[PDB]
């Protein structure tokens, strides 16, 4: 995003549960329920340490949410030119026209469209929590790199033909 875009003060997403996707302002940790689920599952003096990120989880969420909120109600109009006032139902009508689907589907089935997205989001939250391995794309990466680093430490015990494996012992 060129600048962080605000999530509109009025959550007019056509009945869609974007509150599950975007950060929850009431918590000390500014994360969405989808994010809480993943973050709760995806997880020295020996010379090996880990540096902090510049952009913290909340800061990433601020850039992510700006892009996301734009995507759902205004698309790229908050980027390439000044913002466009497209109400969510018209953004959706354009969204369907843009894929070769008549806009009549949005208006005639506005309630079913609202329910299918929300149903799928609920299914996603249940899928990810009932099957922790579903988060494996990040869990395996962090565990594999942690193992490589812990192995780097375990390997200090190797003597490679020496009387002792410890430099300050010899």
């Amino acid at each position: 995003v060129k600048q962080i875009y605000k999530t509109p003060p009025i959550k007019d997403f056509g009945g869609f549960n974007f509150s599950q996707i975007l950060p929850d302002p009431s918590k000390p940790s500014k994360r969405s329920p989808i994010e809480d689920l993943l973050f709760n599952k995806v997880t020295k003096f020996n010379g090996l340490t880990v540096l902090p990120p510049l952009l913290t989880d909340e800061m990433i969420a601020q850039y992510t949410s700006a892009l996301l909120a734009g995507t759902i109600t205004s698309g790229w109009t908050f980027g390439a030119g000044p913002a466009l006032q497209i109400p969510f139902p018209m953004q959706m009508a354009y969204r369907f026209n843009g894929i070769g689907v008549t806009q009549n589907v949005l208006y005639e089935n506005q309630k079913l469209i609202a329910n299918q997205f929300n149903s799928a989001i609920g299914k996603i939250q249940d899928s990810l929590s009932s099957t922790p391995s579903a988060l494996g794309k990040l869990q395996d990466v962090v565990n594999q790199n942690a193992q490589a680093l812990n192995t780097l430490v375990k390997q200090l015990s190797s003597n490679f033909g020496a009387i002792s494996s410890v430099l300050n012992d010899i």
Binding site: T151, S157, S158, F160
Partner: protein
């Protein structure tokens, strides 16, 4: 690759000396296994569409 067989298998003394390198070759036995798994994943990504 089986690094025990590769370096010097069927020998008590070769095994004891290979183990002084810790997990160094264990990681290679593992890297090759990982590559082989990835090769089936590549096949599935390309054809199971």
């Amino acid at each position: 690759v089986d690094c025990t067989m590769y370096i010097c298998g069927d020998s008590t003394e070769c095994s004891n000396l290979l183990l002084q390198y810790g997990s160094f070759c264990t990681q290679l036995n593992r890297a090759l296994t990982g590559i082989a798994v990835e090769q089936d994943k590549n096949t599935q990504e390309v054809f199971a569409q």
